[PDB]
């Protein structure tokens, strides 16, 4: 259906709902909770506004065996539209941990109800790391050059977060932290430069051990991954370019302004140097007279 799924912006309310509902439907230990996600589409940017739980019973043994009460979904839906009839069914949340190729079948069910391709928004509830606990995937059927007679598949989609005005003010009222994703003062940003290096390193390391497995442990040759790595090597920086010379001109500019400004603060504080010393001279006389006053008092 809708091909339009270029970006996914996600309401923090959705997250919050997915985390809470997980426990009040009382599912634990890899027992999946599937619920509906409501919001707008037929739009480039997809905006997931809100969500609601459905009952979901999943058989322990296999992921091909499961119970879902279809009829419930239609009954819930019509009351919900009365509240807000903008919202439409656009797909389903899956309560993590992590993608399955059994989902492909699951997705298809939801497609009956929906007039757009259902979005599979894996809201991971385990919150591993401080990085976003959303991967988004959409079921797409595409042809592939290998020989495969049409493959059916889940393609990763960029996940970001946006909140409404009403929503945003709720986020800030709740929080009481000092914060450090502020990237504000010299201190936060000092950290932030180091943090980014190591951020990169961890990712880079994962790429590196993954490449070993491809040509040694018979993980498939996924041509897409390799294909993408070429742009990284081609658009890698170079030295002895007249760009490098250009950076040096800029470097001189910024250090230059730094020194004029450094001297300029020295002047301001020194004016204060004088002001504290006037005060101090004055108070020598006051201290002297103070004694004479006390003599009378005694």
């Amino acid at each position: 259906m809708s091909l339009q799924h270029e970006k996914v912006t996600i309401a923090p309310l959705v997250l919050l709902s997915a985390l809470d509902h997980y426990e009040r439907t009382q599912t634990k230990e890899n027992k999946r909770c599937v619920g509906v996600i409501l919001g707008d589409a037929n739009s480039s940017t997809i905006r997931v506004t809100n969500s609601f739980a459905l009952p979901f019973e999943e058989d322990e043994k296999n992921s091909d065996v499961w119970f879902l009460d279809h009829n419930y979904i239609e009954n819930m839906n019509e009351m919900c539209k009365k509240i807000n009839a903008k919202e439409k069914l656009i797909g389903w949340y899956h309560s993590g941990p992590k993608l399955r190729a059994s989902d492909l079948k699951i997705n298809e069910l939801f497609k009956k109800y929906t007039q757009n391709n259902p979005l599979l928004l894996i809201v991971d509830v385990k919150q591993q790391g401080v990085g976003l606990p959303t991967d988004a995937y959409v079921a797409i059927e595409q042809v592939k050059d290998d020989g495969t007679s049409t493959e059916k598949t889940f393609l990763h989609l960029p996940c970001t977060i946006e909140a409404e005005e009403a929503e945003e003010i709720g986020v800030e009222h709740l929080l009481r932290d000092v914060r450090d994703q502020a990237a504000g003062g010299l201190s936060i940003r000092l950290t932030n430069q180091l943090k980014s290096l190591k951020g990169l390193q961890s990712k880079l390391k994962d790429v590196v051990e993954y490449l070993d497995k491809v040509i040694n442990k018979e993980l498939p040759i996924n041509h897409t991954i390799l294909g993408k790595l070429q742009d990284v090597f081609n658009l890698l920086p170079n030295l002895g370019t007249p760009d490098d010379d250009e950076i040096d001109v800029e470097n001189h500019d910024r250090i230059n302004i730094s020194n004029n400004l450094q001297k300029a603060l020295t002047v301001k504080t020194n004016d204060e140097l004088m002001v504290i010393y006037i005060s101090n001279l004055v108070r020598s006389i006051i201290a002297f007279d103070d004694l004479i006053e006390n003599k009378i008092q005694n």
């Binding site: 010379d245 040096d248 470097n251 001189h252 250090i255 230059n256």
Partner: protein
């Protein structure tokens, strides 16, 4: 003074200028002086003259930093 005024000067001309005795003598003053970088020159024996070498544009260089 001689290096600044005249960039390329035959070694003959310096001798007359500073009243110094012979060609070999001026050889020896410049040679000791450029070790200390006062003059900041290099003698070109072959051509029979002396070349100033300080020629500015040290901006481009890492030097102002």
């Amino acid at each position: 003074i001689i290096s600044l005024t005249y960039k390329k000067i035959s070694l003959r001309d310096i001798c007359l200028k500073l009243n110094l005795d012979s060609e070999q003598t001026v050889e020896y003053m410049v040679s000791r002086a450029i070790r200390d970088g006062v003059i900041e020159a290099k003698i070109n024996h072959e051509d029979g003259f002396i070349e100033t070498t300080e020629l500015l544009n040290i901006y481009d260089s890492e030097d102002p930093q």
